[PDB]
Amino acid sequence: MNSMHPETLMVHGGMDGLTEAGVHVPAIDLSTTNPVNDVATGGDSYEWLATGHALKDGDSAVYQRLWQPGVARFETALAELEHADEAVAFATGMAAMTAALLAAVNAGTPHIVAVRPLYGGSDHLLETGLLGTTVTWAKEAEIASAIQDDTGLVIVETPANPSLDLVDLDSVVAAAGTVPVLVDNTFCTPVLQQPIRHGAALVLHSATKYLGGHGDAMGGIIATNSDWAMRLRQVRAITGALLHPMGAYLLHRGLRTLAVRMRAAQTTAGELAERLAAHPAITAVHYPGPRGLLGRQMSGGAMIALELAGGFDAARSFVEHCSLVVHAVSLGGADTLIQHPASLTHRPVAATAKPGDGLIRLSVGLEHVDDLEDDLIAALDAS
Amino acid sequence: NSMHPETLMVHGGMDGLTEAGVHVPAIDLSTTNPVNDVATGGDSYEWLATGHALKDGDSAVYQRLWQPGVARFETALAELEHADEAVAFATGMAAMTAALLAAVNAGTPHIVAVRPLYGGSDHLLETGLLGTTVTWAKEAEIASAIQDDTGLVIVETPANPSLDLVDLDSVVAAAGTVPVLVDNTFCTPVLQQPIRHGAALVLHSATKYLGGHGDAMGGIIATNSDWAMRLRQVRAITGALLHPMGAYLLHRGLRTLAVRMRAAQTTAGELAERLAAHPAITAVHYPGGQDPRGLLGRQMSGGGAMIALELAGGFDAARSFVEHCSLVVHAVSLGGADTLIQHPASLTHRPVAATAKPGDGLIRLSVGLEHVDDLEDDLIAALDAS
Amino acid sequence: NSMHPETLMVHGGMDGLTEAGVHVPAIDLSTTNPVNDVATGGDSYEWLATGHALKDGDSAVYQRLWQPGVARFETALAELEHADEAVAFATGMAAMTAALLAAVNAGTPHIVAVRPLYGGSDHLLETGLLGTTVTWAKEAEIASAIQDDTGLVIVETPANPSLDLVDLDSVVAAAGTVPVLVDNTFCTPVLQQPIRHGAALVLHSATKYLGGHGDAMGGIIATNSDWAMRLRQVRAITGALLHPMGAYLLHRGLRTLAVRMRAAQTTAGELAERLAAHPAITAVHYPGLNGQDPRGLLGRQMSGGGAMIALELAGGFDAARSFVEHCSLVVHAVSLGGADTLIQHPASLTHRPVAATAKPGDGLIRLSVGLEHVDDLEDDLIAALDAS
Amino acid sequence: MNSMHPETLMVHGGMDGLTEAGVHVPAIDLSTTNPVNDVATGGDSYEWLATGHALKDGDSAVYQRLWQPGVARFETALAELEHADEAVAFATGMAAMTAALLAAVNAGTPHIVAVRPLYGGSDHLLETGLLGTTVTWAKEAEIASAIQDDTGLVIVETPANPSLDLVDLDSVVAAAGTVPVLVDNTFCTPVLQQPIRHGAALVLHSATKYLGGHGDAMGGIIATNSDWAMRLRQVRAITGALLHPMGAYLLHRGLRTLAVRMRAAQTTAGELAERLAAHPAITAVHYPGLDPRGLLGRQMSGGGAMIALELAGGFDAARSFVEHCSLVVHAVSLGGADTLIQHPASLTHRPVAATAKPGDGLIRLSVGLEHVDDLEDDLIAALDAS
Numbered sequence A: 001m002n003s004m005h006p007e008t009l010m011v012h013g014g015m016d017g018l019t020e021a022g023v024h025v026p027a028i029d030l031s032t033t034n035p036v037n038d039v040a041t042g043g044d045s046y047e048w049l050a051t052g053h054a055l056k057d058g059d060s061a062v063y064q065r066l067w068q069p070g071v072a073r074f075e076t077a078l079a080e081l082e083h084a085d086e087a088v089a090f091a092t093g094m095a096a097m098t099a100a101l102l103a104a105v106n107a108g109t110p111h112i113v114a115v116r117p118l119y120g121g122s123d124h125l126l127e128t129g130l131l132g133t134t135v136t137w138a139k140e141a142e143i144a145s146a147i148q149d150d151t152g153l154v155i156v157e158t159p160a161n162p163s164l165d166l167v168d169l170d171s172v173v174a175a176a177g178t179v180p181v182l183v184d185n186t187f188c189t190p191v192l193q194q195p196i197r198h199g200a201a202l203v204l205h206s207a208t209k210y211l212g213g214h215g216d217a218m219g220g221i222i223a224t225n226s227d228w229a230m231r232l233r234q235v236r237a238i239t240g241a242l243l244h245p246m247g248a249y250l251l252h253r254g255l256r257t258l259a260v261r262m263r264a265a266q267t268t269a270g271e272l273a274e275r276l277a278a279h280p281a282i283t284a285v286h287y288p289g290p291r292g293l294l295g296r297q298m299s300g301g302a303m304i305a306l307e308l309a310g311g312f313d314a315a316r317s318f319v320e321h322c323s324l325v326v327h328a329v330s331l332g333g334a335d336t337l338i339q340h341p342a343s344l345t346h347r348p349v350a351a352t353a354k355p356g357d358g359l360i361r362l363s364v365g366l367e368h369v370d371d372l373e374d375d376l377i378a379a380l381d382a383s
Numbered sequence B: 001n002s003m004h005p006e007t008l009m010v011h012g013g014m015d016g017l018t019e020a021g022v023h024v025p026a027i028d029l030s031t032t033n034p035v036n037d038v039a040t041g042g043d044s045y046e047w048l049a050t051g052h053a054l055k056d057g058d059s060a061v062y063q064r065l066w067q068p069g070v071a072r073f074e075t076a077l078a079e080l081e082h083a084d085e086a087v088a089f090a091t092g093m094a095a096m097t098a099a100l101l102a103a104v105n106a107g108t109p110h111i112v113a114v115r116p117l118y119g120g121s122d123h124l125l126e127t128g129l130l131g132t133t134v135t136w137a138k139e140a141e142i143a144s145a146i147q148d149d150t151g152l153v154i155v156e157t158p159a160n161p162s163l164d165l166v167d168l169d170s171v172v173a174a175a176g177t178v179p180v181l182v183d184n185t186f187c188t189p190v191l192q193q194p195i196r197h198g199a200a201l202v203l204h205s206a207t208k209y210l211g212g213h214g215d216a217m218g219g220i221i222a223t224n225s226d227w228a229m230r231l232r233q234v235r236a237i238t239g240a241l242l243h244p245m246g247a248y249l250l251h252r253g254l255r256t257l258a259v260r261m262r263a264a265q266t267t268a269g270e271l272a273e274r275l276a277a278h279p280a281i282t283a284v285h286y287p288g289g290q291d292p293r294g295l296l297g298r299q300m301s302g303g304g305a306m307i308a309l310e311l312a313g314g315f316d317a318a319r320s321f322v323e324h325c326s327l328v329v330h331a332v333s334l335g336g337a338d339t340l341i342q343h344p345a346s347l348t349h350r351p352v353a354a355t356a357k358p359g360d361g362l363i364r365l366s367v368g369l370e371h372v373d374d375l376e377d378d379l380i381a382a383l384d385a386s
Numbered sequence C: 001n002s003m004h005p006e007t008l009m010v011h012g013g014m015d016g017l018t019e020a021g022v023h024v025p026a027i028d029l030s031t032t033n034p035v036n037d038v039a040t041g042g043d044s045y046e047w048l049a050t051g052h053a054l055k056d057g058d059s060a061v062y063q064r065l066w067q068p069g070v071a072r073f074e075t076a077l078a079e080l081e082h083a084d085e086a087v088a089f090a091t092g093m094a095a096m097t098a099a100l101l102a103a104v105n106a107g108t109p110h111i112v113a114v115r116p117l118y119g120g121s122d123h124l125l126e127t128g129l130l131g132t133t134v135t136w137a138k139e140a141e142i143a144s145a146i147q148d149d150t151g152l153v154i155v156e157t158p159a160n161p162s163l164d165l166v167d168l169d170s171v172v173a174a175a176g177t178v179p180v181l182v183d184n185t186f187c188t189p190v191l192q193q194p195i196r197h198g199a200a201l202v203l204h205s206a207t208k209y210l211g212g213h214g215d216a217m218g219g220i221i222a223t224n225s226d227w228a229m230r231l232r233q234v235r236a237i238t239g240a241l242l243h244p245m246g247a248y249l250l251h252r253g254l255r256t257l258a259v260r261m262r263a264a265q266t267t268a269g270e271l272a273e274r275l276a277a278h279p280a281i282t283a284v285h286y287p288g289l290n291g292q293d294p295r296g297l298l299g300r301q302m303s304g305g306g307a308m309i310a311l312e313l314a315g316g317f318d319a320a321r322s323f324v325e326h327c328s329l330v331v332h333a334v335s336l337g338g339a340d341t342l343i344q345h346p347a348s349l350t351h352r353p354v355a356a357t358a359k360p361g362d363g364l365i366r367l368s369v370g371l372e373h374v375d376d377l378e379d380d381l382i383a384a385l386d387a388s
Numbered sequence D: 001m002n003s004m005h006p007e008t009l010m011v012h013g014g015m016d017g018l019t020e021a022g023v024h025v026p027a028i029d030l031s032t033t034n035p036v037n038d039v040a041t042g043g044d045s046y047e048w049l050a051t052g053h054a055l056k057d058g059d060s061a062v063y064q065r066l067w068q069p070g071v072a073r074f075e076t077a078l079a080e081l082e083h084a085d086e087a088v089a090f091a092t093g094m095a096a097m098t099a100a101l102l103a104a105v106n107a108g109t110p111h112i113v114a115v116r117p118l119y120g121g122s123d124h125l126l127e128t129g130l131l132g133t134t135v136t137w138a139k140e141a142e143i144a145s146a147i148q149d150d151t152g153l154v155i156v157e158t159p160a161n162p163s164l165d166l167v168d169l170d171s172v173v174a175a176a177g178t179v180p181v182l183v184d185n186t187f188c189t190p191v192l193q194q195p196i197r198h199g200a201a202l203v204l205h206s207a208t209k210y211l212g213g214h215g216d217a218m219g220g221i222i223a224t225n226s227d228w229a230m231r232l233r234q235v236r237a238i239t240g241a242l243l244h245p246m247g248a249y250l251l252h253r254g255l256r257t258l259a260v261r262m263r264a265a266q267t268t269a270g271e272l273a274e275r276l277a278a279h280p281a282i283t284a285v286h287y288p289g290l291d292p293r294g295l296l297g298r299q300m301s302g303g304g305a306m307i308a309l310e311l312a313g314g315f316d317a318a319r320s321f322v323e324h325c326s327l328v329v330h331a332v333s334l335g336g337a338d339t340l341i342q343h344p345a346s347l348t349h350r351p352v353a354a355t356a357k358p359g360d361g362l363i364r365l366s367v368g369l370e371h372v373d374d375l376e377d378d379l380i381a382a383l384d385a386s
Ligand SMILES: CCCC[C@H](N)C(=O)O
Pocket: A120, A121, A329, A330, A331, A339, B062
């Protein structure tokens, strides 16, 4: 597990002891409750798990809200890829972010210096302050100044959603100093980026996108140090946003095919963005590749943003004229997905010739570049 | 039409399935849902994000906004409980968390909680993790403990693990303008319905009884449209969703609920009576002179499937009792297919001496679907081992 | 063990789970199973290919040889049926197919099958797809129809869809040296146990009652070690395996079987009595009802009337077709033992394109009583009958 | 689904109408029985499905043994990749082969001209004659002579198991003439080999290997013309070796990642066999891309992900090599996510002595999705331990 390449680590990660048990894949244990050997041993295991610690070997899991073996394997698998001490799995990416914010509030640090742009849900949860949080939206150059004596977390996302703007993680961690940094590494995945290497304390992942890879398993996981993992596990035990054994099995199963899926989707996206650049209907294409963020932080990407000349009307027509490419709000699936991010806020437009709002997000799937190029070209021509 | 609860448990939430050509609800694992139009999809997104239910003929947009499998399970329980709508979460604690978070954001962070309460619910209010201020009051101190900042009144009947009953008619009258949340996990919609008494929210830990087999984790609140909208808004941003597989098993479990509860309660009623005639046990706690205010018949149409045993030996006798059981499995849960046993005093105390404290002798027992002779013979053998 | 059937249904097949620290059996989807040693793995392969059960502490080798989830469900039903072992297949027809294939390879392709039999079982013997020769004999013609080439005697009680009872004590006595296969799908191990009467094989379509919710497809035969070995050999090469998910749901369904059967039978016993007092129906077919127990089989063979009812309508096929299409709560589908009440017209499977005719015969309607209230089921069926 | 490249066809194949229904993945319908609209329409659908025909749109599936929608989507998906008229899915690869043999017997053609080498199970099923079949084991050049007026099928497998010897499919179909040809395309998959293009009538696939791709879903499917697909569907309706909805969903899901998995596994295998050739312990390496007949390019667009190893030590060295692997798992299967190793000679021979016999030095290896450096370092360590 230490001398293995990431491709080998994705397949055998979290599969510890399975070869020895006589099985090929991890068993799906749906057990809500777990019987105990001795009242004394079961009571100790209850206190140990309720305090946020990891289940010691040879001890009963006690209850699924305290510990689930299926979830546990998926947690260790991602922690190995991200090179973090431990990982904590939740029902969704928003449930992991919710627990990270709730832990900061209870530790006496309700203030968060978030750096925009951020994912819609993360941006709205901080803005609402539903979990008793204070937010200070600062730019990349205003991080060190926006830090208060009450700050508990610095939430950053690279590449940004949906603009795909890169943020230098080496500068963020240096500006935060004593404050831990949470990096939403959903778009990059552990294949292309590892925020732990740059200095981030927490690495948020929406397992729904890329980690699952098929658009069927909902999930969220944070790869962080033992201290933060304990806080996150304490919140999970009382708030109960658990990952179902079936979801945990499909997310762990999806990690095995992650290296090959990302390598293929990134190759297709690199050619697709270059081919789409040679089009009169698109003014500019947004694809990673000025500070030399590539190589130092990211080893490409499978997402492309397209700014159209027609604005909202051309973007709306482009989304509805796609047949092979599916119009839905998600990413990292098996098929190519398309979405209009401006349409989520500007909805009852009623077909007006808007000058702006012409950005279209696109999540490259596992299809041939010729078929995706021909489909999107057909949709662009329909105007 | 006017359906009996037994029929309503089987066909509830199964609307349109006969017409679609299927026997059981399909398990749609889809994380994202494609949209017909950009304009129609955007409206469905705003409608679902604002906490409203998915209108027919509209895309679910995303699983965090709406899941069809979860939706069927929600309507099935709401019919069983006679509440306007229901909201399903990953666990019973996730439903309680969303109920507390909604109260805080509505400007009512204060909660007047009536003890005894379930371990997790009690610890969540004491910690104040969600920005809540608790005021632990007795049944007769409810109206006095209500502050101008109170948003919810959390009560639980029968209590855990003492099985003490609380008069829901008195609680709702004392709360007045403040909504009442009743944790009806032990009772289920078969024996008790807090909506008919005046409660605004009805919390259920679907893990116990609703699942009925000890394999599906869940939590659901049957409440009025206004409170369901607030709960749905919290679920959309906090994301403590119920997995399609979990939602299918919890809904499937509702069909066999009437027959399971009527059999487990019958076994429990005889088991508690047979355990009373034992030298080791000083007193048995089973609702069915246990009834003080005539709550059975008026609030509960049965004694339930839970029994609490007061042992004479104290902690040591309770510890050996749950360790000598072979057929009865020692675990921390209830409402499963098999009979479960637990020592509630052991979760806080781990002594190395002969202790006889009030509560140390209490043993919780969740009656399963086994024969009363086999359960009596196993527990009688474990008691003799001392 | 000294356990009552109700306790045995819940804890049966759950051996070692309490000790492992789990509440329910794990769902192991593993197609292949790694081996500890080449020598130990090779022995486990030969042992499982020869039709023997997996010895404890040995690799399952491959799913076609052994599946732990299926294994738990097999032992759970073998305990309820009091048979030595049990073999689980994809469907009830896959279990019957393996039973017929084993008989052919043992040099006994002849089967003395007594009618009436289930549609699929009857059609498989008539077609002779597996190289079998059938001899359809009545209950009193069993001993005479037995040839020196007979390998199995297939009987079904109650019959489908007439619900006619067959005396299993007379069948086993007439078969003598020939093993008897009894389809105990309609009765389940709760009300009937063919092993107690002398049957060698007990066929069950786990889809009906054993699953109990209409979601898991299955088939299992509770039989002696010799027939279980023959059956296990056919399953290893023909590969009609039970998927781990299906095996888990069928095993899970056994826990709630005692309470489901007692409730459905109670509802059926009252439903048939209330339906008898109706002008549209001429005769009701229910084992518990008076007139449907000729040899005193209630108590000796069946400890209940079951949850199936057959209705003889005065209008014939058209009254039966109108009755099926006028049901709203009761679902019209071809199956039994589900959570909800199902209705079907058995004559419609063969006499399908009857367009607005007034045929005198074929007025039988099969009904599988579910877990609903007797008042709601009576009110729905009484409304469908009035629609004529 | 016509002008698409195989990589695109693997992702969107069998996903017809899902985008229109508002879902991202096919729903898992576990329904054993299917309700009907009319008695007359339901009876016609029963006869249509029992006679081996595919379900017409807008008709009830009637029963799972007659039709399953989940299985149906997987059959559509594979048949598109194989360019065959229809496909029939069964519980296992052996269940598909069993139905193919049973259909031939009932059509009055119990004779099968099989060409050695064949897969263990397929070879043992023909030798036993359990389904009333008479086999005639003939070489590639003795096909036309071994054909009797009673022959119904010609079963061939390329590459052979475990030798990986290639068979010219153009010569087999020409020698069979009027007799349909069944090709076991398990190892090759529709990515590298297409038997329909060469003239084969039936294409057998063990969906357990490669089609699933993770070692969790058991399956078997035959891509064949409408006539043979009807005869196979008739056998499936009465013999009932059905594919469970969960298995069918995972096998269909696995088709989406098939192109990327086989391109990566084949690349790793092509380098691994070349690196293993430069080793003192191995006398010869068996890998298609290391070709005298010119079958690569004409029949196979790649060397595959399977490698056979001929060791100098015989049985002793092969057994030691299998037990000295730590990263590579010793199990009897192929096409999984991880690299698997097996000793084929050990299944029949369980000896005390060293036993240097022909085939005892052969080791089968199924290349997974790992790095070539990690697999070379592990196998080189296991060889040094021997
Ligand atoms: C919070 C709205 C849901 C948006 C969706 N998760 C996306 O990928 O755009």
